[PDB]
Hints:
The complex is a heterodimer.
Chain A: H1 6-14, H2 26-29, H3 36-51
Chain B: E1 2-6, E2 12-16, H1 23-34, E3 43-45, E4 48-49, E5 66-69
Parallel strand pairs in B: 1-5
Antiparallel strand pairs in B: 1-2, 3-4, 3-5
Amino acid sequence: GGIRKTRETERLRRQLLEVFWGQDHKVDFILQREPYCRDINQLSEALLSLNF
Amino acid sequence: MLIKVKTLTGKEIEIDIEPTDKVERIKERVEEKEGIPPQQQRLIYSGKQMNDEKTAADYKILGGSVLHLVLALRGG
Lengths: 52, 76
């Protein structure tokens, strides 16, 4: 591709502010939608950050 | 008073607004939460359409009611 939302999504979730993955409702929203970029965000971020 | 909105994807959004506020203001709150303009988002309750010139109180909505939202299309 070219650009990924992984950086904004995990950074929010890790220590920074709720950006993509974040934005209140958006937190889960990234993967639970349709695009691949968002899919990785909640998938990799919400699953790995919450569990581990 | 807090209320939950229903999206076309099957997701209930959680927002906090007063019954004396206008439907258009609630639409703005939605835009900042999901990322979609208000003019492309409609709000339906009971079976009637809510106008931007009317308020939530006009539809006797209170903290705990579930409001429906249906506007903007991605496919065809």
